[PDB]
Amino acid sequence: AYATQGFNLDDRGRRIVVDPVTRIEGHMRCEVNVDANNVIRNAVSTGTMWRGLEVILKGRDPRDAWAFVERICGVCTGCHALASVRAVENALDIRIPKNAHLIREIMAKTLQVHDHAVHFYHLHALDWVDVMSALKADPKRTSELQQLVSPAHPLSSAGYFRDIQNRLKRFVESGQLGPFMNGYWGSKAYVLPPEANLMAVTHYLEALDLQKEWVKIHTIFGGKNPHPNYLVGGVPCAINLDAASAPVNMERLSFVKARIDEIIEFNKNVYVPDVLAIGTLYKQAGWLYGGGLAATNVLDYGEYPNVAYNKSTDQLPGGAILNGNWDEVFPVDPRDSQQVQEFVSHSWYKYADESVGLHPWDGVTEPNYVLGANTKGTRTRIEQIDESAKYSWIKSPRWRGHAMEVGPLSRYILAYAHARSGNKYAERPKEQLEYSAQMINSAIPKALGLPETQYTLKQLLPSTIGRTLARALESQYCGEMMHSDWHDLVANIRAGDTATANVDKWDPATWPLQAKGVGTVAAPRGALGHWIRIKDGRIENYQCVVPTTWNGSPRDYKGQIGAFEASLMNTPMVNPEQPVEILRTLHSFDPCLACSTH
Template sequence: MPVNGNRITVDPITRIEGHLRIDVEVEGGKVSNSWSSAQAFRGIETIMRGKDPRSAWAMTQRFCGVCTTTHALCSIRTVEDALNVPVPVNAHMLRNLVSTMQSLQDHIVHFYHLTALDWVDIVSALSADPATAGKIAESLAAYSPIGKAWPTNSFNAMKNAKDRLAAFVGTKNLGIYGSGYWGHKDMRLTPEINLIAFAHYLEALEYQRKIAEAVAIIGSKNPHIQNLTVGGVSTAINFDSMAALNMERVQWIKKLLDDTADFVRCVYIPDVIAIAGAYKDWFNLGKCSPNYIAVPDIPMNSELTEFGLKGGIIIGDNFREIKTWKDEALRKGITENTTHAWYKNPQDTLHPYDGEQIPSYTDWQENGKYSWAKAPRFEDNVTQTGPISQVLAGYMAGDPLVKKYVDFVASKAGVTIPQLNSVMGRNAARAIRSLLMVDHAYLCLEKLLDNCKTDQSYVNYLKEVPTDKEYIGVGFNEAPRGMLSHWIKIKNGLIENYSAVVPSTWTAGPRDDKGRKGPYEESLMNLPVAEMDKPLEIIRSIHSFDPCIACAVHTIDPEGKEIVNVKIR
């Protein structure tokens, strides 16, 4: 982490997916300039050219080791949109279950294992009194949306966590905890609350595993699910068969969901609110573009006219709801700019259908090219996506479930809705989204069971890709980090061009042709930096977006080898 005069370079940012470099200039104790640089080159889109569109989902979920299911699902939707392939309701419900449960795993991991240590001083927990910690933990039931106490919030659990931490520190091999900014001036939690957070950190490992197991039951594997096919899923449904998705497996899924739902409602939400209470000023720090985009998701019928999650676009004070994936303004309004990205394209700004990934590496140039991420824009506006965009879009559209949870968390944290556009607000929005994912997972499971009473169909197979003309399509998905879109051109039955515009590209992108910073860069401006050699504030702001840089860049297998072959029966 080099410091050169008033310049700080954090490379790499750790506890994220992928490789990210952040540079800032500090004047008067605050950030005066910033750069976000994705440091990896990917290129799967280029590999896609000439491949059978039906196999696209299997390759594109290799964009990332975290959001594998979201890319697979978005890719399937892209091909189905291009070729106008209908999907049975049961298949939508199974896909929705995979999507919502994968999001739950992702959000639990992000808060506890990727960002909590920005706010929690692990070393301080060694001086905590377990009895006091147990009493405080019991009181956190007041922050649960169901008012339920967590059974392990007790003296015994806190003492056990402290003993485990002391034994670990005693080895003098701190591993991932070794380079934390322990003792930083802005670490504010009491030793007891730090101990509670550490105890829940350990428990979260088990609950993220449980919900990942539920995804694997449906998807046959996790990560990189195996049960998708254009037109539905390959998960046969027969409640009386041992070789299909039967009632035993459904009940197993529900038990895992029940356990994880309790953890989210009784531990995750109270912890976010409790930590936010100690860092309330961070609801006023890290603000970025007041423009937001989210798409409708969790389709509830084959006609794609009903969605569990509402979509919307907020540009300044103007809100317009997106009710369908066919929205022409949505499809036409997205572009990517490469003025400051390491690509040499025919034009600096291209629509995703015409997207190119021609590398043009120049080394890091402050006023030139400095990132492998492009700069997406919506109708030429710097726009952010993510849980904050999704909850604000739902709130503005009047979604009662969103309003219920936003109002609950905001009131308990003592903040206003506009303050969600902040470092702590992004963490709160992700927790709110977790509550939404729990409820929608239950709704989809219930609808699956009800529908299967009269209809157990799960796929409309596409046996041949038509070669009569050119086809274009786009798939959308509200991934854990925000709006994901895949764009395809099909010619002679094969993929002619493929582009993915992912959530972390929207937020991590560099400046555009007008010199406008991306959301990461904007969020860092005027941020206080207490210690130049321990830029904890920078880490906090960037981690609040839950960066996934592996998804945000573009790569190619230099030998052009086929990665997977999908057979359609």
């Protein structure tokens, strides 16, 4: 046992293993220890995959890099491609034209919406929603609940709900439950009434059909989804209005606009109201666990400047907060070797000296799969991982030595803090948060006949409910932003600027013989960075630090825990053999393990 970051880690209680963690991207193992009362008193995050993209990139052409690193992940598809082209453009001092900037922003914001919404309904919702309980909802009461939760949502009639319910019924009555097989249904960890469950499962199915429409924005600008194409110097989708032979004409842009408007409708009428309502009911049940590091330390690089290449105009303004002090946002510099560093003390890698963290321009990725002496089982059959030694394929990123949480919650806490200091570019997220607090505290309880609470944003946000909430609000905000981006794009084209690529430094003969660059992206899951070194036209070093690398990190040299492990701490389990609470909180980070390890 030892104490760190205000958490009392104790590994003396009953050990529970969750391998595999399902409803995530990629491969994860989680181990916890629970005390005599089923409270988690220790948590162990193990990334159980590695592919070695950073090794694979060495010696290749920087212009090709985006396509390789895009295949780090098909879920956060395109964010690595964006980071890569930004990194190369940074190294080579290339400025992209305005249309390329706007198209990349639209593509980025499309990913945010698609990623966030699919995660909540298809990965996260079954931690809050009991599908078997939905089988007993009154279709009328469900229609009634729908009208209260989101008055504007057109799909609300009673007949529509018994239609959905009956298809589920005979699906379940078939005896082949498919993805619902061996679920944890009926657990007391579920608190929603039948009506809420049916409403949510209905939206699960609605979202599954709709999500495929949203990505057609990627298809237009980038050819395909998953894995749309990108370009060093701009975008490949050349523009011509007067035309049907160019990649982008006014008809294609009208199509993009129609999809954006559908997105804004879904966020406002389905996604945000569901999360507000589900969040309210679990708040009523007292389930405010899972805050972890969000209560103290949060980080983002900052993103979405309304004036290109001017970081002070970031609409999700970033930086770092420490020790729960929301009055002081520290600036974060991705170039500073004393800020972002990665340790491998407890990771399956080796450094020359593992008592230090390496800034990614000096990063090293050399595999070292070795298990500690206190392991139960063998090298090829682990029964209990030994967290006192190396226990993950994920490196341990820290900022000035501090363990940080990254993600939509971090960005929203940071935006809130910025707004209080006078930053007007963060006004909308602040408005969203205060609207949400008032809905969760007063408005929704009043509509549902529940007692009204008085939680502040400081109390409500650092929680699994808060983390889930911020993801939904970010989706809504991203939809609103790309709606404005579309107008700016069309206006710029109509003013006469059709440029989409800067090719002045496309040829390697124009490059400096040595160069380094960094590209950062506010990816769906948090702070993403790619750091590159170029020598004689080839990649000398390529290092990625990815959002789930931050969140899922194992312990560092000082033994400080990362966001996953901190968030599981101090959480009671209804049944220690059913990982319902573990999944609910882990899933609230939207873990992408392929991303985390690359």
